[PDB]
Amino acid sequence: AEEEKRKAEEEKRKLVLVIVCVALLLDNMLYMVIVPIVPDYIAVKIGVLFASKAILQLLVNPLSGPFIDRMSYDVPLLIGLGVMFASTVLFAFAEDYATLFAARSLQGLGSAFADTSGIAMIADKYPEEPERSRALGVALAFISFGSLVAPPFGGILYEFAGKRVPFLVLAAVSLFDALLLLAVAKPPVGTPIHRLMLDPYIAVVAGALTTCNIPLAFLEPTIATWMKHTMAASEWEMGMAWLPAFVPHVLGVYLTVRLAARYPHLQWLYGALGLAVIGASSCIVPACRSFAPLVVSLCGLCFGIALVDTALLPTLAFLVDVRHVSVYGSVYAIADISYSVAYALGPIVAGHIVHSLGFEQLSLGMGLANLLYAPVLLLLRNVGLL
């Protein structure tokens, strides 16, 4: 009678959860597999390429906020996966420099239309605290799986085949996922965004996401030359250095979901612990001389970003549910802005800072920026009262 429709609605919930998580996995695969291929095909500006992706993702998101607010979620998710498919097909036969440039900018456009609406859709069909925390935890777990084990197993199959075959196969996989979303999904006025910068705790979560995401923006185009300069830097362990930093991320997301379920007041405290672990994991970086201490420092850094993201995105959706209209367009767009600011300031400025100032000084300044934004989360003792 009723339980038939309830189990059908549970299937329709879990199915779009698995589909959007696989879409996010392929998205982060496509972000992290392209970066060792563009310097092979040359013939600062490479930083102009990557920061152009991030700056186009920055410029679309306030303009795109009302598009997810004023309309539904299935249409921008379909637009996002379609633009991402077109970008991957453009990367399949990207020959000149302008081809790579336009393809990377369209990948940023697909980011702005896909990732924000996907994290909104996962946080829309769970209007309750432990299930929303579990769903966002599994979403960030697949995002971390992509961004932290996909580039080695993409580069391995890049070595002995080329690039024309596997990018077309992976774009066909992404279009297969988009057609499955079309086959099963079957396709109020919200709160504006120009007031949300004057909304203070939204701004606190935005600054915390930016300071959380700043080490992976200022270390991924940076640590590679620091392998050759100081470290022994074997190729198996230079290419696969980010592979062991996956299991602490899943351990951190399980700890954060478990401490968010058993405790409704310890989101922000373990989030400040996450910022503290990010700051300490940035400060350890000069002291490492051999390989495995650097590995465990990167593992601590990914543990910290897992804690911070899983403790603050349900807090962000909770704050939208408390104070404003229950829509999820512009506020995860503020979250994506908080990603794009760090990933825009990263690749251009990091190499010039290291070549001018030094790498130990940059790492200490980054750790001090983390640990001095750590007393900004003192204010979040007044959220669970609401």
Ligand X SMILES: CC(=O)OCC[N+](C)(C)C
CB of 216 or CB of 278, closer to ligand X: 216
CB of 28 or CB of 267, closer to ligand X: 28
Q: Any idea what the Cα angle at residue 80 is, between residues 79 and 85, rounded to 5°?
A: 95
340 binds ligand X (CB under 6 A): no
First to last CA, the chain: 38
CB of 190 or CB of 317, closer to ligand X: 317
CB of 181 or CB of 305, closer to ligand X: 305
**Cα 112 from Cα 47, distance rounded (Å):** 20
150 binds ligand X (CB under 6 A): no
* Beta-carbon contacts of residue 54 (< 8 Å; ≥ 6 apart): 108, 340, 343, 344, 346
Could you tell me the smallest distance in angstroms from the CB atom of residue 24 to ligand X? 9
Q: Given the rule CB under 6 A, which of 38-46, 76-84, 139-147, 170-178 is the region that contacts ligand X?
A: 139-147
CB of 28 or CB of 88, closer to ligand X: 28
CB of 55 or CB of 190, closer to ligand X: 55
28 binds ligand X (CB under 6 A): yes
Which amino acid is present at 94? A
**What's the count of helices (H) and strands (E) in the chain, helices before strands?**
14, 0
Could you tell me the smallest distance in angstroms from the CB atom of residue 205 to ligand X? 14
Report how many residues bind ligand X under the rule CB under 6 A. Answer: 10
143 binds ligand X (CB under 6 A): yes
CB of 190 or CB of 215, closer to ligand X: 215
Which amino acid is present at 236? W
Q: Given the rule CB under 6 A, which of 92-100, 126-134, 140-148, 189-197 is the region that contacts ligand X?
A: 140-148
Could you tell me the smallest distance in angstroms from the CB atom of residue 3 to ligand X? 38
Task: Give yes or no for a contact between 330 and 65, defined as CB atoms under 8 angstroms apart.
Answer: yes
Task: Give yes or no for a contact between 13 and 125, defined as CB atoms under 8 angstroms apart.
Answer: yes
Q: State how far Cα 380 lies from the chain centre.
A: 23
Whole-number Cα distances in Å, 146 to 143, 170, 180, 184, 294 = 5, 13, 20, 24, 21
**Stretch 302-321: interaction string toward ligand X, x if CB under 6 A:** ---x---x------------
For 33-63, b/e burial (b = at least 16 CB within 10 A) is bbbebbeeeeeeebbebbbbbbbbbbbbbee
220 binds ligand X (CB under 6 A): no
336 binds ligand X (CB under 6 A): no
**Cα 152 from Cα 157, distance rounded (Å):** 9
CB of 52 or CB of 147, closer to ligand X: 147
216 binds ligand X (CB under 6 A): yes
Q: Which of 19, 26, 31, 77 binds ligand X (CB under 6 A)?
A: 31
In the complex, residue closest to ligand X by CB: 147
User: Which residues are at the interface with ligand X (CB under 6 A)?
Assistant: 28, 31, 143-144, 147, 213, 216, 305, 309, 339
